[PDB]
From a paper:
MOSC proteins play a key role in the Moco-dependent reduction of N-hydroxylated mutagens or prodrugs as a final electron transfer enzyme in the nitrogen-reducing system. To provide insights into the catalytic mechanism of MOSC enzymes, we report two crystal structures of YiiM, one from Gram-positive Geobacillus stearothermophilus (gsYiiM) and the other from Gram-negative E. coli (ecYiiM). Based on the comparative analyses of structural and biophysical data, we present the common and distinct features of YiiM enzymes and propose the putative catalytic site that is located at a reactive invariant cysteine residue. Sequences corresponding to the β-barrel and N-α-bundle modules of YiiM are conserved in MOSC family members, suggesting that the two modules form the canonical structure of the MOSC domain.
Numbering used by the authors: 0 to 16, 20 to 39, 53 to 210
Write the structure that this text describes.
Amino acid sequence: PMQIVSINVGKPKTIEVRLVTGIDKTPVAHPVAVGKQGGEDKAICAYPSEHFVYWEERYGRPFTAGAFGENWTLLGLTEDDVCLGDIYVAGTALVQVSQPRQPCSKLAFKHQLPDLPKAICQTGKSGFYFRVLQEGVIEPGAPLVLVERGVGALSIAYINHIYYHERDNAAAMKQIASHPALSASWRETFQKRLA
């Protein structure tokens, strides 16, 4: 009971500065190609559907698939159970956990909830990104099968906790920064801190 319950797709837009993808993504009912492409590290944004229950209770309104701008709405995989470096088979694709997802102002504007990013940081209900190790195709309801536990078994919950609360924990940061699966940007941040 670990799966992608929804694959959500958004519309591209250009800004004057480049092409960016919108935070508004709609659930689709058909197969979707999973391609490799900073951009690579954040290829797929994933969010645990379990947390929608909490958000509906906190804010008194619905939260359904796509509500956090996620490509993949997940079932059975929360931040406590998913580790940096975990490799999963999804459809014909292979994906690897690269970093926690940080809360952002686009999400606050989407829901018109200015305290939502703070709440995400306080609760740790953030979701996480995957990089794509092997391109393929997935369908809604696809199982996500763990094929390798990230070395060190460092959970996304643990990594968020160090990043947001233990900014003066040297041993913790060096260790996470040392992980070969960590996104370059998170590595850099842990190396700017630590100096």
